[PDB]
Amino acid sequence: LEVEAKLAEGRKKIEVELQEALGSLEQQKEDTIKSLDSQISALSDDIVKKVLP
Amino acid sequence: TIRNSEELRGKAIEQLEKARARLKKVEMDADQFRVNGYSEIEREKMNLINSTYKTLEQFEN
């Protein structure tokens, strides 16, 4: 019973570590969408040379 | 009647010698077995905690 309680508490700790990491990477992708815009312009400008021969 | 009585004294006294020897030897089994089973279940205790710690690291993996 003692080590099962230790297991459950460690499992909660790793769950909160998970939510911190996932919220961080969602904020990270929010940042790279809000930034990275010359990439958008050049990526539009590159495919226009490929749609036409 | 003399023969019956002193033969019964000798055979009962070696019966009690073998019975007290069996008391000491089965007490030797008892306390040897006490030490053995006690240490055996403490290493099986450490086996239980190792298994659970390993499955916790599997979880975090």
From Swiss-Prot, chain A:
It is found in: Plastid, Chloroplast thylakoid membrane. It comes from the Eukaryota. Belongs to the ATPase B chain family. F(1)F(0) ATP synthase produces ATP from ADP in the presence of a proton or sodium gradient. F-type ATPases consist of two structural domains, F(1) containing the extramembraneous catalytic core and F(0) containing the membrane proton channel, linked together by a central stalk and a peripheral stalk. During catalysis, ATP synthesis in the catalytic domain of F(1) is coupled via a rotary mechanism of the central stalk subunits to proton translocation. F-type ATPases have 2 components, F(1) - the catalytic core - and F(0) - the membrane proton channel. F(1) has five subunits: alpha(3), beta(3), gamma(1), delta(1), epsilon(1). F(0) has four main subunits: a(1), b(1), b'(1) and c(10-14). The alpha and beta chains form an alternating ring which encloses part of the gamma chain. F(1) is attached to F(0) by a central stalk formed by the gamma and epsilon chains, while a peripheral stalk is formed by the delta, b and b' chains. In plastids the F-type ATPase is also known as CF(1)CF(0). This is ATP synthase subunit b', chloroplastic. It comes from Spinacia oleracea (Spinach). The lineage of its organism: Eukaryota, Viridiplantae, Streptophyta, Embryophyta, Tracheophyta. The gene is ATPF2. The chain holds residues 168 to 220 of 222 of the full protein.
From Swiss-Prot, chain B:
Signal peptide: none annotated. It is found in: Plastid, Chloroplast thylakoid membrane. F-type ATPases have 2 components, F(1) - the catalytic core - and F(0) - the membrane proton channel. F(1) has five subunits: alpha(3), beta(3), gamma(1), delta(1), epsilon(1). F(0) has four main subunits: a(1), b(1), b'(1) and c(10-14). The alpha and beta chains form an alternating ring which encloses part of the gamma chain. F(1) is attached to F(0) by a central stalk formed by the gamma and epsilon chains, while a peripheral stalk is formed by the delta, b and b' chains. Belongs to the ATPase B chain family. F(1)F(0) ATP synthase produces ATP from ADP in the presence of a proton or sodium gradient. F-type ATPases consist of two structural domains, F(1) containing the extramembraneous catalytic core and F(0) containing the membrane proton channel, linked together by a central stalk and a peripheral stalk. During catalysis, ATP synthesis in the catalytic domain of F(1) is coupled via a rotary mechanism of the central stalk subunits to proton translocation. Component of the F(0) channel, it forms part of the peripheral stalk, linking F(1) to F(0). In plastids the F-type ATPase is also known as CF(1)CF(0). This is ATP synthase subunit b, chloroplastic. The lineage of its organism: Eukaryota, Viridiplantae, Streptophyta, Embryophyta, Tracheophyta. The gene is atpF. The chain holds residues 63 to 123 of 184 of the full protein.
